[PDB]
């Protein structure tokens, strides 16, 4: 539904405990499975920047990445919650600088900034203690420039410059599905696509809880698998027909018995997109 | 010959044994009519109660002194303590007299019961007064019904019903006062 | 998040005027169908004093008809007589008889299958779409005499007033399959009447109980249709209250958020001013 | 490894980790002190290690209640047998000035960290209202000449709380199982002091006010409480599929509640009526009586084992208990006891009176 | 520090230990609420400080149920198991019959279908609600208050419909022997000697609903 | 029309217009609760219809084209 | 509105009368006092009123009372902003009000 | 909401306003079609409250 | 919804009693009599209670 090209920044936005890291971890684990099968030129080296997280959460991730074998390709840049606010503000830029080694020398990178929303809170701390005057939710003025400086470094370079790429995955936490927040609206404007993860879709059973009507890829099907470009266009449209016919039969007013076919097939299709965690396909 | 002592009152007592105790008994159509057949009375001498009905109207329910009913043997008349009667009626004119004044409904057929308590219950389907019938198009379709008789045995009866209805309708517009 | 609460007041205010329109749509449909349900109440009266009323007979074959609605904002009317179906469909079986369960109304096939799906054989719907006529109720009755039972059961809601709808079981025995067999005690109750038919008494009673079937079916789906409009009226009154109680809690919640965002934007403005002064 | 608490909604839906960080999120009167005293009652006696109770900015009456009830429990021994005590108390309660409430969580950890680092053993740290640490620094931060952050808090909220919470961990030398009550202000979970704490915890037990107004105690939101232990490779696939199936019918019931309020249950599909019937049943079955709440509710408390929790909710999901009424599931231990309570409910509806005389009320005997 | 404003104040309301004299101070903070919103800032601060609440509903106050005590939300957990032993016997049934009354009135207030078992609850629930409402500036002793609820959670008031229950209470508390208030005061609880004595005095009171 | 008021009111109305617009604003006021029920045309009350059709006769009257005042 | 108090207080305290005082729109008293706090550089309170809202009202409303000399009774018109009775300007005003007279269309 | 249905370009047909939409600028057979199309789309949105 | 003569005679007894209470709360004013013609009525308190 929301396919990702090489050199494209894609937002993983959602509430807490909706599976935003699990989408990001499965991108890292899958690159290890793909790096054993491709030639040496097109291998993706992941960088995971963990800003403001627990140190136990980070030690659980390097335990998973060592056990899966994904640690051979992964850099883990860790600015935990006890670190100074300039170490968590600066950790996305330091991880992007490590990831831009692979972009600049013809290889392919994958940077994951888990909670750019926690980088902005650490940048608000330094700004307010350097007595810079606050703005919306006490954030500084240049907090759009904080994230557009960082995310525009994810590029696909020319063949004159090596052809390397860096693919970014910012993670943004919303509060109650409130994507109208200040930092969330900045990053939706910066990134190309958006993977919106929902809480009520998560508990309905649909996990990875992808809001298919709100999730975009601005690159689109130009950089997706041709074996799914012809198959998932049927799947994108049949899920679009699934949505409105499920809003009316939520009430139980009447049946058309020809819209009941699209309610039956998309329910297989919604059940088709479910997936277990830590097993990328 | 009396294997099932049924009735409304018996159905209440047995239904409390099979249904839940939450539900009260369903109602029955005996609980909505107060006039019975074998219940003695309801004649009052001269004028007897006439319940002339249709599916879509109650055309009379007050008392009359005589009812000319168009039975299949022929037109008979009912006085107050008439014999109990289940009379299938032809297409014909029900005459409701109250005295000097009489109202004449032409009906399509359908039964008329005289109950042992003197209650007449005329039960027809379409009961048009002759004031709202026109005598022109009655023979316009009767001449067509006198022509179209194929070997359809279902239309054997339906054309027979078509002919005998208009033919009695022809004869009952002619003698009006 | 101050537009999500404002668009819910968009929803509940439109619902609370939809459901108040459907309250008076059903109220005017209850009154012009009361002038048809009172005229039709007359013709069921002679057949219940000629043939009596015998709900609990030990029929060999029965056809039970639970006549329900077509549209379903009725408020548990189509379920109360589906509940009253098995209350009489378990009661009158004392010997293991055949039963054909019929439903008039599209909300009957979806609820009678939940109880008896192996005895459910007929589904009449689209009845009340234009109006209910006796020729229509005749054709429904002639499809019920294709099967010939010994008894018929009609389950419907009797429209008593706009408030109370006591359900009725109206029973029709087949002409001598049980009908004269229940009158003949120390003689007969039917032998008082002098038959003026063309053919036999056993032949006029064949004509007379089909006419008794079509009459009490025409009354049933006319009593039920006027009972449906009067329970939709009480259902759409209870939902305008529920959409007014919900709208009142949302407006209290909106005013609290309206006051809170004015305080929040002002504290942001004074903090930015105090950082410069 | 799992920490069995004996609480149904906890052990099923958001199970606690034995060396992990646990947060109980609450909104002033929803029940996170009764829940944290129940975990002291259930977990902290079968734990076999030392406990530290850091009371940070809560009631002094509650500090006296826990202290006295630990003396009669033998958890605290006074006099010459003081060394046989299992709990040490650090109290910085809500009469203290905001400097004392801003640091008393740190001296509660220091006692817990000595048992973890030097003594090398397993500690239970119970911190009642770690929000009051954040609030006391917010009273102070105005007077330290700082520009305030969002809602009105300190600019340093996340690193002040982060520097404290990162000390409360299980290391390679010892363990700290930390249960912390987290107050949410004005029932707002997007308030930055609750919102920052969520990232610091392995298991968050969110207690709701609407759940408590339906009489369900513990007032745990089943669709807002989360553990990292709810993972099929950690708790097993039989436990995991029951918890995810319980959450699925509770979520689909929540999707129906807009229609059930307006249209009623008469307009539901009977597929959806089986959802509302089951999800009303497991909503009552998630509640249970507490052995610390018996002193004001009258009902004796029920420790429910994990195996009785999993099998009991699996029966209601498959449909084995659709017979029983929805009030038989309310405030009972396990699925043996809903059948014990449904029998009593049926029996009572028959026998209600006929106690006129020839009882002990004779006017002379 | 508006929490510390109130918390450092209400923490001084304590029961002291016996080496400090055994004295006590009990506080009644009053918080005004806007439109019933209990989740406001200052309201939820004082709920986190105090031991219980007495919620006074605007909707029960408009119906004339005064004091408009929201029974489902008003709590006193420190004061329970510190109350009158006679009242603790009779109010366990009173809290429970009101707990069912709110639960049964939650199901069907409009006339869908009325069970005979639930119309016992609406008959007993409206009995006890009219029992508990009292008028202003005339507080009742606890022994006249135990007897009046003893006369209501038990029988002795099912004859009166709902209207004369206020007049049945002074029909109860004036017509019983005033010695029965002295034994209940001095023992503290209802002894089985006083139990059927008080059943005896409550059968010879003449009730205004006849 | 429900929200547009004039505190001066009809004391500065053109007389003659005051004779006929006094009942115009009333017939539109009754129409406004009866409006948004006009999607029920197949279902009708026949006194609710008279204020419904006349209410649409009057809102179509008050339309104008710009830069041509009357 | 304090000039209106002072004229009504002479009739109460010197003439000894039962005075009526009509404060036409007590909300505009609140609204004007909220502007003079904003112009004097004071930090606005909740929704945006002056920090001294309850003592700007209570300073006026407590001079309207019954003394031993006479009485002042105040019939003061109340505007409810945004049809919100929980707004702090009517909510502070309604703590002083002893009766409401609602005129309806 | 126009984009979520698949209509592309996702132009809100009611909210889009131009100053060339006067009849004395684009003629009457362009103005009345545009005002006719907007009337049918506005009526449908007032019925979509009751259809859904 | 139902009709005027639909409901009970006691519910019509209130309607007759309320409508002549709802009328009786009206009163002509002495300051309005220079443009209304109807003279003003000061109604005493005991005459208001005993009248109602
Ligand atoms: N696709 C999935 N299938 C099954 N379970 C999942 C899936 N994704 C996540 N989970 C479970 O849901 C929980 C939340 O996942 P995750 O930690 O990825 O959320 P998050 O967005 O990173 O939340 P946060 O960073 O706010 O803690 C995890 O415990 C994980 O085990
Ligand atoms: N598990 C429970 N069982 C019964 N009642 C409870 C329970 N939890 C809370 N309550 C009720 O709610 C109140 C909440 O008190 P407490 O737990 O101290 O709240 P807080 O979360 O504010 O600390 C208790 O006094 C009790 O009356
Ligand atoms: Mg994460
Ligand atoms: Mg507490």
What DSSP string runs through C198-239? SS-HHHHHHHHHHHHHHHHHHHHHHHHHHHHHHHHHHHHHHH
Fold of A1-218: Rossmann fold (3.40.50)
Instruction: Mark whether E77 is an active-site residue.
Output: yes
Residue nearest ligand 2's atom 3 by CA: D217
H or E element, residue D51: strand D50-56
A25 Cα nearest atom in ligand 1: 18
Residue nearest ligand 1's atom 31 by CA: D231
E63 phi/psi in degrees, rounded to 5: -80, 0
Which residue in D32, D52, D37, D49 sits closest to D5, CA to CA?
A: D37
Instruction: Give the C window 210-269 contacts with B, CB below 8 Å.
Output: 211, 215-216, 218
- Please give the structure tokens belonging to residue A7: 């050199």
CB contact under 8 Å between B18 and C192, yes or no, is: no
Option in D151, D266, D270 nearest C75 (CB): D266
Residue A45, C-beta contacts closer than 8 angstroms, at least 6 positions apart: A31, A73, A74, A75, A99, A102, A107, A108, A109, A110
Q: How many residues does chain E have?
A: 210
Query: In this complex, how many residue pairs, one in chain F and one in chain H, have their CB atoms less than 8 Å apart?
Result: 5
Whether the CB-CB separation of B92 and C200 falls below 8 Å is answered with no
- Please give the structure tokens belonging to residue C209: 């109980």
CA distances from D103 to D23, D107, D133, D191 (A): 19, 7, 7, 22
Separation between Cα atoms, residue E28 and residue E10, nearest integer Å: 9
CATH number for position E129: 1.20.150.20
Task: For ligand 1, pick from A11, A17, A48 the residue to mutate: most ligand atoms within 8 Å of CB.
Answer: A17
Please state, as a whole number, how many other Cβ atoms lie within 10 Å of the Cβ of residue F4. 5
CATH class, D1-228 region: alpha beta
Q: Residue E22 forms beta bridges with which residues?
A: none
Chain D contacts of C231, Cβ < 8 Å? none
What DSSP string runs through E19-81? GGTS-B---------STT-TTSHHHHHHHTTSSEE--B-HHHHHTT-SS-B-TTT-EETTTTT
* CB A275 less than 6 A from any atom of ligand 1: yes
- Please give the structure tokens belonging to residue A216: 């975009």
The Cα diameter of chain H in Å comes to 39
Which residue in B93, B75, B86 sits closest to B112, CA to CA?
A: B86
Option in C252, C262, C270 nearest G47 (CB): C262
Chain mean position to CA B74: 15
Which residue in D284, D238, D275 sits closest to D256, CA to CA?
A: D275
Pick the CATH number of D230-354 from 3.40.50.300, 1.10.599.10, 3.40.50.1100, 1.10.1140.10: 1.10.1140.10
Residue nearest ligand 1's atom 15 by CA: A19
Query: In this complex, how many residue pairs, one in chain C and one in chain H, have their CB atoms less than 8 Å apart?
Result: 3
H or E element, residue C123: strand C120-124
- Please give the structure tokens belonging to residue A184: 């969330």
CB contact under 8 Å between C246 and D151, yes or no, is: no
Whether the CB-CB separation of D110 and D76 falls below 8 Å is answered with no
C156 phi/psi in degrees, rounded to 5: -155, 170
Fold of C1-24+236-277: Helix Hairpins (1.10.287)
Separation between Cα atoms, residue E42 and residue E203, nearest integer Å: 50
- Please give the structure tokens belonging to residue A152: 């525009």
Which residue in B144, B71, B149, B83 sits closest to B114, CA to CA?
A: B83
H or E element, residue B95: strand B92-97
Identify the domain containing residue E100 by its residue range: 84-210
Separation between Cα atoms, residue E43 and residue E48, nearest integer Å: 9
CB contact under 8 Å between I2 and C27, yes or no, is: yes
Angle at H46 between CA H39 and CA A260, to 5 degrees: 115
Which residue in D319, D352, D342, D301 sits closest to D8, CA to CA?
A: D301
Alpha carbons within 13 A on the beta-carbon side of F66: 4
B69 phi/psi in degrees, rounded to 5: -105, 135
Separation between Cα atoms, residue C16 and residue C242, nearest integer Å: 8
CA distances from E194 to D365, E181, E183, I33 (A): 13, 10, 8, 73
Option in D148, D151, D266 nearest C76 (CB): D266
The Cα diameter of chain G in Å comes to 42
CA distances from A69 to A31, A61, A76, A276 (A): 10, 12, 14, 19
Which residue in C136, C110, C145, C100 sits closest to C219, CA to CA?
A: C136
D278: helix, strand or coil: helix
B76 phi/psi in degrees, rounded to 5: -115, 165
Q: How many residues does chain F have?
A: 70
State the residue for tokens 């023992």.
Answer: E187
Separation between Cα atoms, residue A174 and residue A183, nearest integer Å: 9
Chain C contacts of F49, Cβ < 8 Å? none
What DSSP string runs through chain A? -----TT--EEEEESTTSSHHHHHHHHHHHHHHHHTTS-TTS-EEEEEEEES--HHHHHHHHHHHHHHSGGGSEEEEEE-TTS-HHHHHHHHHHHHHHHHHHHHTT-EEEEEEETHHHHHHHHHHHHHHTTPPP-GGG--TTHHHHHHHHHTT--B--TTTTS-EEEEEEEEE-SSS-TTSHHHHHHHHHSSEEEEE-HHHHHTT-SS-B-TTT-B-SSGGGGS-HHHHTTHHHHHHHHHHHHHHHHHTTTT----SSHHHHHHHHHHHHHHS---TT---
Q: Residue D207 forms beta bridges with which residues?
A: D220
Give me the sign of the Cα torsion angle G29, G31, G34, G40. negative
- Partners for C (CB, 8 Å, 3+ pairs)? A, B, D, E, F, G, H, I
Residue B17, C-beta contacts closer than 8 angstroms, at least 6 positions apart: C91
Separation between Cα atoms, residue E75 and residue B47, nearest integer Å: 77
D129 Cα nearest atom in ligand 2: 23
Which residue in D2, D6, D108 sits closest to D50, CA to CA?
A: D108
H or E element, residue D26: strand D21-26
Chain I contacts of C240, Cβ < 8 Å? none
Separation between Cα atoms, residue E29 and residue E49, nearest integer Å: 10
Task: Give the strand pairing for B112-114 and D21-26.
Answer: unpaired
CA distances from G11 to B26, C235, G19, G68 (A): 78, 61, 7, 13
Task: Give the strand pairing for D16-17 and D2-3.
Answer: antiparallel
Q: Say how many Å lie between the CA of residue A8 and the centre of ligand 3.
A: 21
Separation between Cα atoms, residue F28 and residue F54, nearest integer Å: 8
Method used to determine the 3D structure: cryo-EM
CB contact under 8 Å between G85 and E35, yes or no, is: yes
Measured in angstroms, the resolution is 3.0
H or E element, residue C30: helix C4-31
Could you tell me the end-to-end alpha-carbon distance of chain D, in angstroms, rounded to an integer?
A: 64
- Please give the structure tokens belonging to residue G38: 């904003």
Task: Give the strand pairing for D175-183 and D21-26.
Answer: parallel
Chain H contacts of F65, Cβ < 8 Å? 23
What DSSP string runs through D183-224? E-GGG-TTSHHHHHHGGG-SEEEEB-HHHHHTT-SS-B-TTT
Option in C255, C263, C270 nearest G84 (CB): C255
CA distances from E77 to A139, D301, E81 (A): 44, 17, 8
DSSP category for residue E141: P
Which residue in B113, D328, G83, B154 sits closest to C197, CA to CA?
A: B113
State the residue for tokens 């994990």.
Answer: D306
Give me the sign of the Cα torsion angle A27, A33, A34, A39. positive
Whether the CB-CB separation of E81 and E39 falls below 8 Å is answered with no
Q: Cis omega before residue C116 (within 30°)? A: no
Q: How many residues does chain I have?
A: 52
Which residue in A255, A262, A210, A258 sits closest to A238, CA to CA?
A: A262
Residue B100, C-beta contacts closer than 8 angstroms, at least 6 positions apart: none
Separation between Cα atoms, residue G71 and residue H8, nearest integer Å: 73
Task: Give the strand pairing for B102-107 and A193-197.
Answer: unpaired
C268: helix, strand or coil: helix
Which residue in F42, I6, I2 sits closest to C27, CA to CA?
A: I2
Which residue in D106, D118, D101 sits closest to D50, CA to CA?
A: D118
Judged on CB neighbours under 10 Å (0-12, 13-18, 19+), A263 is middle
Q: Residue D3 forms beta bridges with which residues?
A: D16
Please state, as a whole number, how many other Cβ atoms lie within 10 Å of the Cβ of residue G24. 11
CB contact under 8 Å between D255 and A204, yes or no, is: yes
Q: Would you list the domain boundaries of chain D?
A: 1-228, 230-354
Separation between Cα atoms, residue D187 and residue D30, nearest integer Å: 10
What DSSP string runs through B106-163? EE----EEE-TTS-EEEE-S-EEEGGG--SSHHHHHHHHHTT---S-HHHHHHHHHHH
What DSSP string runs through G51-81? TTHHHHHHHHHTTSSB-SS-EEEE------G
- Please give the structure tokens belonging to residue F28: 């539109």
Give me the sign of the Cα torsion angle A176, A178, A183, A187. positive
Task: For ligand 2, pick from D5, D34, D36 the residue to mutate: most ligand atoms within 8 Å of CB.
Answer: D34
Task: Give the strand pairing for E75-76 and E52-53.
Answer: antiparallel
Torsion of CA B63, B66, B68, B74, to 10 degrees: 130
Separation between Cα atoms, residue D8 and residue D42, nearest integer Å: 12
I46: helix, strand or coil: helix
Angle between helices E85-107 and E118-132 (to 10 degrees): 130
């Amino acid at each position: 539904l929301v396919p990702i090209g090489r050199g494209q920044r894609e937002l993983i936005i959602g509430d807490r405990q909706t599976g935003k890291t699990a989408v990001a971890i499965d991108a890292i684990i899958h690159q290890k499975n793909c790096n054993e099968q491709v030639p040496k030129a097109q291998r993706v080296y992941c960088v995971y920047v963990a800003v403001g997280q627990k140190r136990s959460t980070v030690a659980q991730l390097v335990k998973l990445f060592t056990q899966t074998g994904a640690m051979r390709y992964t850099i883990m840049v860790s600015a935990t919650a006890s670190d100074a606010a300039p170490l968590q503000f600066l950790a996305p830029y330091s991880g992007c600088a490590m990831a831009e080694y692979f972009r600049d020398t013809g290889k392919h990178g994958l940077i994951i900034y888990d909670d750019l929303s926690k980088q902005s809170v650490a940048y608000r701390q330094m700004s307010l203690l350097l007595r810079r005057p606050p703005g919306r939710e006490a954030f500084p003025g240049d907090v759009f420039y904080l994230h557009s400086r960082l995310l525009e470094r994810a590029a696909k370079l020319s063949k004159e410059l090596g052809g390397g790429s860096l693919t970014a995955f910012p993670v943004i936490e919303t509060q109650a599905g409130d994507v109208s927040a200040y930092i969330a609206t900045n990053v939706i404007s910066i990134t190309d696509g958006q993977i919106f993860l929902e809480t009520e879709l998560f508990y309905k059973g649909i996990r990875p809880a992808l809001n298919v009507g709100l999730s975009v890829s601005r690159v689109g099907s130009a950089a997706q698998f041709p074996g799914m470009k012809q198959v998932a266009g049927t799947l994108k449209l049949e899920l679009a027909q699934y949505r409105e016919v499920a809003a009316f039969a939520q009430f139980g007013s009447d049946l058309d018995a020809a819209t009941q076919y699209v309610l039956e097939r998309g329910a297989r299709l919604t059940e088709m997109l479910k997936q277990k965690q830590f097993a990328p396909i | 010959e009396a294997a099932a002592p049924a009735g409304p009152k018996e159905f209440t007592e047995v239904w409390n044994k099979k249904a839940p105790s939450t539900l009260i008994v369903p109602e029955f159509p005996s609980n909505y009519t107060a006039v019975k057949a074998v219940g003695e009375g309801q004649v009052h001498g001269d004028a007897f109660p006439v319940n002339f009905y249709t599916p879509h109207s109650i055309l009379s329910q007050a008392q009359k002194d005589t009812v000319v009913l168009p039975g299949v043997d022929g037109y008979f008349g009912v006085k107050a303590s008439h014999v109990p009667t289940i009379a299938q009626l032809k297409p014909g004119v029900v005459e409701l007299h109250s005295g000097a004044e009489s109202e004449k409904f032409f009906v399509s057929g359908g039964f008329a019961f005289v109950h042992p308590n003197g209650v007449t219950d005329i039960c027809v389907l379409e009961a048009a007064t002759l004031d709202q019938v026109d005598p022109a198009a009655v023979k316009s379709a009767l001449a067509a019904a006198s022509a179209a008789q194929p070997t359809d045995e279902f239309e054997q009866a339906a054309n027979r019903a078509a002919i005998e209805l208009y033919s009695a309708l022809e004869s009952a517009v002619e003698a009006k006062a | 998040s101050n537009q999500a609460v404002k668009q819910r007041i968009r929803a509940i205010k439109n619902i609370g005027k939809i459901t108040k329109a459907m309250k008076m749509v059903a109220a005017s449909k209850m009154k012009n169908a009361q002038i048809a349900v009172e005229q039709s109440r007359g013709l069921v009266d002679p057949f219940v004093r000629l043939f009596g009323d015998f709900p609990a007979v030990n029929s060999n074959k029965s056809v039970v008809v639970a006549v329900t609605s077509d549209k379903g904002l009725c408020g548990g009317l189509n379920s109360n007589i589906t509940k009253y179906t098995r209350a009489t469909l378990a009661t009158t079986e004392s010997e293991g008889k055949d039963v054909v369960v019929v439903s008039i109304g599209d909300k009957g096939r979806s609820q009678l299958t939940r109880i008896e799906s192996q005895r459910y054989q007929l589904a009449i719907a689209d009845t009340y779409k234009v109006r209910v006529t006796f020729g229509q109720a005749s054709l429904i009755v002639e499809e019920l005499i294709k099967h010939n039972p010994q008894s018929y059961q009609i389950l419907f809601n009797k429209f008593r007033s706009a408030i109370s709808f006591k359900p009725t079981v109206a029973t029709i025995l087949s002409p001598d399959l049980l009908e004269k067999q229940l009158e003949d005690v120390t003689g007969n109750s039917l032998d008082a009447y002098d038959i003026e038919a063309s053919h036999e008494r056993s032949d006029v009673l064949r004509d007379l109980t089909e006419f008794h079937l079509g009459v009490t079916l025409y009354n049933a789906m006319l009593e039920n249709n006027c009972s449906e409009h009067a329970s939709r009226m009480s259902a759409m009154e209870n939902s305008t209250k529920s959409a007014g109680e919900m709208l009142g809690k949302l407006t209290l919640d909106y005013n609290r958020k309206r006051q809170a965002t004015i305080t929040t934007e002002l504290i942001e403005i004074i903090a930015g001013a105090s950082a410069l002064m | 490894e799992i920490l069995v608490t004996g609480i149904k909604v906890v052990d099923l839906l958001a199970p606690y980790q034995r060396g992990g960080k646990i947060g109980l999120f609450g909104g002033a009167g929803v029940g996170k002190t009764v829940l944290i005293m129940e975990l002291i009652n259930n977990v902290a006696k079968a734990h076999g290690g030392f406990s530290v109770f850091a009371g940070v900015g809560e009631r002094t009456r509650e500090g006296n209640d826990l202290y006295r009830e630990m003396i009669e429990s033998g958890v605290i021994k006074l006099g010459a047998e003081r060394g046989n005590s299992k709990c040490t108390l650090v109290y910085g309660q809500m009469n203290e000035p905001p400097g004392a409430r801003a640091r008393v969580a740190l001296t509660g950890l220091t006692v817990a960290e000595y048992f973890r680092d030097i003594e090398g053993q397993d500690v239970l740290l119970f911190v009642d209202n770690i929000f009051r640490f954040t609030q006391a620094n917010s009273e102070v931060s105005a007077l330290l000449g700082r520009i305030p952050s969002a809602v009105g808090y300190q600019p340093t909220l996340a690193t002040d709380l982060g520097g404290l919470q990162e000390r409360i961990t299980t290391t390679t030398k010892g363990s700290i199982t930390s249960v912390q009550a987290v107050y949410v202000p004005a029932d707002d979970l997007t308030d930055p002091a609750p919102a920052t704490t969520f990232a610091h915890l392995d298991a968050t037990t969110v207690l709701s006010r609407s759940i408590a107004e339906l009489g369900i105690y513990p007032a745990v939101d089943p669709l807002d409480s989360t553990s990292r232990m709810l993972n099929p490779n950690v708790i097993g696939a039989e436990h995991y599929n029951v918890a995810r199936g319980v959450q699925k019918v509770l979520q689909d019931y929540k999707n129906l509640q807009d229609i059930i309020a307006i249209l009623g249950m008469d307009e539901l599909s009977e597929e959806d009526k089986l959802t509302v019937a089951r999800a009303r049943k497991i909503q009552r079955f998630l509640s249970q009586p507490f052995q610390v709440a018996e002193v004001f509710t009258g009902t004796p408390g029920k420790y429910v084992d994990l195996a009785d929790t999993i099998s009991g909710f699996q029966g209601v999901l498959t449909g084995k208990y659709d017979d029983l009424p929805e009030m038989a599931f309310y405030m009972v231990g396990d699925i043996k006891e809903v059948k014990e309570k449904a029998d009593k409910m049926a029996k009572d509806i028959a026998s209600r009176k006929e106690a006129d005389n020839k009882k002990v009320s004779e006017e002379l005997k | 520090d508006v929490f510390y404003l109130h918390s450092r104040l209400l923490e001084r309301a304590a029961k002291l230990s016996k080496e400090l004299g055994g004295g006590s101070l009990t506080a009644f903070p009053v918080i005004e609420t806007q439109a019933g919103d209990v989740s406001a800032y200052i309201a939820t601060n004082v709920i986190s400080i105090t031991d219980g609440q007495i919620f006074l509903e605007t909707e029960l106050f408009y119906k004339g149920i005064r004091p408009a005590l929201n029974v489902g939300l008003s709590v006193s957990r420190v004061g329970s198991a510190a109350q009158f032993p006679g009242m603790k016997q009779v109010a366990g049934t009173l809290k429970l019959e009101l707990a069912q009354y709110r639960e049964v009135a939650a199901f069907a207030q409009f006339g869908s279908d009325l069970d005979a078992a639930t119309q016992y609850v609406l008959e007993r629930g409206a009995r006890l609600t009219e029992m508990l409402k009292q008028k202003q500036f005339a507080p009742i002793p606890i022994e006249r208050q135990t007897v009046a609820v003893y006369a209501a959670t038990k029988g002795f008031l099912d004859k009166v419909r709902v209207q004369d229950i206020v007049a049945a209470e002074e029909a109860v508390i004036s017509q019983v022997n005033p010695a029965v208030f002295k034994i209940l005061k001095a023992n503290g609880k209802i002894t089985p000697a006083l139990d059927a004595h008080l059943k005896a005095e409550l059968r010879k009171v003449k009730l205004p609903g006849a």
